[PDB]
Amino acid sequence: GVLYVGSKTKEGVVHGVTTVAEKTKEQVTNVGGAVVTGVTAVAQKTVEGAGSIAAATGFVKKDQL
Amino acid sequence: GVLYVGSKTKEGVVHGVTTVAEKTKEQVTNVGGAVVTGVTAVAQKTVEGAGSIAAATGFVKKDQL
Amino acid sequence: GVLYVGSKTKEGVVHGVTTVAEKTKEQVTNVGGAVVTGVTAVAQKTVEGAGSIAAATGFVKKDQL
Amino acid sequence: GVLYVGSKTKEGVVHGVTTVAEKTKEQVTNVGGAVVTGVTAVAQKTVEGAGSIAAATGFVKKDQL
Amino acid sequence: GVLYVGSKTKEGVVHGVTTVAEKTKEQVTNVGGAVVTGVTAVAQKTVEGAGSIAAATGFVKKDQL
Amino acid sequence: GVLYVGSKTKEGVVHGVTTVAEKTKEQVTNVGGAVVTGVTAVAQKTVEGAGSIAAATGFVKKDQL
Amino acid sequence: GVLYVGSKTKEGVVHGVTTVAEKTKEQVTNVGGAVVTGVTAVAQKTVEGAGSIAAATGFVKKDQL
Amino acid sequence: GVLYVGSKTKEGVVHGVTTVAEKTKEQVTNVGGAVVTGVTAVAQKTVEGAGSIAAATGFVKKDQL
Amino acid sequence: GVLYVGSKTKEGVVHGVTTVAEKTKEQVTNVGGAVVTGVTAVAQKTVEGAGSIAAATGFVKKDQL
Amino acid sequence: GVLYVGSKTKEGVVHGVTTVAEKTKEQVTNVGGAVVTGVTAVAQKTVEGAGSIAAATGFVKKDQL
């Protein structure tokens, strides 16, 4: 069991990520893959089970078992 | 069991992500894949089960088992 | 069992994501894939079951099992 | 069982996502895929069942099992 | 069972997403796919059943099992 | 003299001031003065003349010359 | 004289001041003065004349010349 | 004289001041003065004349000449 | 005289001042003066004249000439 | 005279001052003076005239000439 009393629990918390990103003449050319160019924020508590993937940012899988 | 009393629990919380992104003459050319260019925010608590994927941002899978 | 008393639980909460994105002469050319260029916000609690996918932003799958 | 008393639970909540997005001469040319360019907000509690997909924003699937 | 007493539960709630989006000379040319360019807001509680899809914004499926 | 040609002049312009102000149990007790608690927006071009006051927000004067 | 040609002049311009101000149990007690608690935005071009005051926010004067 | 050609002049410009100010149990007690507690934005170009005051935020004067 | 050609002049410009100010149990007690507790932004170009004051934030004067 | 050609002049410019100020149990007690506790940003170009004061933040004067 789990018991909290009068507590202030902050679990999986992302506070105030400030970004001032100035670019000029940007070019991106992806080809059949995965690209992430930006602010990201993932918060998780519990992930269970055989063969599990959690908060996969930019994941690429080619499986041929 | 789980018991809280008088608590302030903040689970899976994303607070105030501020972005000031100035670009000029941006170009993107994706070809048959996955691209993410932006502010993202995912909050999760519980994920269960065999073969599970949670909060997959930019995920690419080619499976031929 | 789960029991809360007098609590303030904030589960899976996305608060005030502020974006000031100024662009000029943007071009995007996707071809048969997945593209995300924008503010996103996903909040989830519980996902269950074998072979589950949760909050998939930009997901690409080609399965030929 | 689940029991709350005098609580203030905020589950799966997206509060006040403010966007000031100024563009000029934008062009988008999608071809047979999935594109998302905008503010999105998804809130979910419970998803159950084998082979489940939840809050899929930009999802692309080609399955030939 | 589930029992609430004197509570203020806010489940699956999207509050006040403000957008001031100024564009000039925008062009979009989709071809046989899925495009979303706008403010979206989806709120859900419960989704059940084998082979379920919930809050699918921009979903594309070609299945030939 | 003043001459404009083909111009886009934006003089004294206040664009899109967004406010999400959540309060709880506020109390104000003014006594014989000046109080401003709110969003304000004043735009002016030209003010002329001896002894002039322009866009006075919260002004208090007791003059006994 | 003043002459503009094909220009884009932005004079005295306040663009998109975003505020997310959350308070709880605020109290204010002014007594015979000047108080400003809020978002303010003043834009001015020209003020002329002996003894001039422009965009006075919170001004207090007691003159007994 | 003043002459602009094909220019982009941004004079007296305040762009996107973002504030996320969370307080709890604030108290203010002013007595016969000047108080400013908030976001302010003043833009001015030209102020002329003997004995001039411009963009006075929180000004207090007691003159007995 | 002043002449610009094809220029991009940014005079008196305040860009994107981001503040995430979290307080708890704040108290202020002013007595017959000047107090400023907040984000401020003043932009000015030209101020002229004998005995001039410009962008005075928190100014206090007692003159008895 | 002054002449610019094809230039990018940034005069009196304050760019992106980011502040994450967390306090707890703050107390301020001013008495008949001047106090500034906050983010400030002043931009000026030209100030002229005998007996001039520019961008005075926290100024206190008692003159009895």
Cα–Cα nearest to B57, from C26, E51, E30, A38 = A38
Q: How close E59 gets to chain C, by Cα (Å)?
A: 9
Give the whole-angstrom CA distance, residue G50 versus residue G52. 6
CB contact under 8 A, A20 and I18: yes
Characterise D32 by phi-psi region: left (phi > 0), alpha (psi -120 to 50), beta (else). left
CB contact under 8 A, H27 and I23: no
Amino acid type, H10 = K
- Residue I20 contacts residue J15 (beta carbons within 8 Å): no
- Find tokens 């708890």 and name the residue: I24
Interface probe with B: pick from D60, D61, D64, most Cβ of B within 10 Å: D60
Residue A10: CB atoms within 10 Å: 14
- Residue B22 contacts residue C24 (beta carbons within 8 Å): no
Q: Which residues contact F29 (CB under 8 A, 6 or more apart)?
A: G28, G29, G30
Full strand arrangement of the beta sheet holding F19-22 = F19-22, G19-22, H19-22, I19-22, J19-22
Partner residue opposite D21 with nearest CB, options C3, C19, C40 = C19
Give the whole-angstrom CA distance, residue H52 versus residue G53. 6
Characterise I25 by phi-psi region: left (phi > 0), alpha (psi -120 to 50), beta (else). left
Cα–Cα nearest to H22, from G26, B55, D23 = G26
Partner residue opposite I64 with nearest CB, options H18, H39, H65 = H65
- Residue C55 contacts residue D54 (beta carbons within 8 Å): yes
Beta bridge partners of residue J42, listed in sequence order: I42
Residue-wise burial string across E53-63, b where 16 or more C-beta atoms lie within 10 A, e elsewhere? bbbbbbbbbee
Amino acid type, A52 = S
Give the whole-angstrom CA distance, residue B25 versus residue A27. 8
Give the whole-angstrom CA distance, residue I9 versus residue I16. 18
Residue-wise burial string across E3-13, b where 16 or more C-beta atoms lie within 10 A, e elsewhere? eeeeeeebbbb
Concatenate the DSSP letters of all residues of I23-56 into one string: -SS-EE---SSEEE-S---EE--EE-SSSEEES-
Residue positions counted in chain E: 65
Cα–Cα nearest to G42, from G58, G53, G57 = G57
Pairing of strands D2-5, C2-5: parallel
CB contact under 8 A, J35 and I58: yes
* Chain A and chain J touch, per 3+ beta carbon pairs within 8 A: yes
- How many I/J residue pairs have CB atoms within 8 Å? 254
First-to-last alpha carbon distance for chain J, in angstroms, is 40
- The angle formed by the CA atoms of residues B9, B12 and B17, to the nearest 5 degrees, is 110
Residue C62: CB atoms within 10 Å: 17
Interface probe with C: pick from G17, G18, G19, G24, most Cβ of C within 10 Å: G18
Half-sphere exposure at residue B52, Cβ-oriented, CA atoms within 13 angstroms: 27
- Find tokens 């992430």 and name the residue: A36
Residue positions counted in chain A: 65
Residue positions counted in chain F: 65
Give the whole-angstrom CA distance, residue B19 versus residue A63. 37
Interface probe with I: pick from A14, A18, A19, most Cβ of I within 10 Å: A18
- Residue H57 contacts residue I57 (beta carbons within 8 Å): yes
- Residue D4 contacts residue B4 (beta carbons within 8 Å): no
Residues in E whose CB is inside 8 Å of some CB of C read 33, 50, 58, 60
Amino acid type, D43 = A
Q: How close I20 gets to chain B, by Cα (Å)?
A: 8
The technique by which this structure was obtained is: cryo-EM
Q: Which residues contact H8 (CB under 8 A, 6 or more apart)?
A: G7, G8, G9, I7, I8, I9
C15 is in an annotated binding site: yes
Exposed, middle or buried, B17 (CB in 10 Å: 0-12/13-18/19+)?
buried
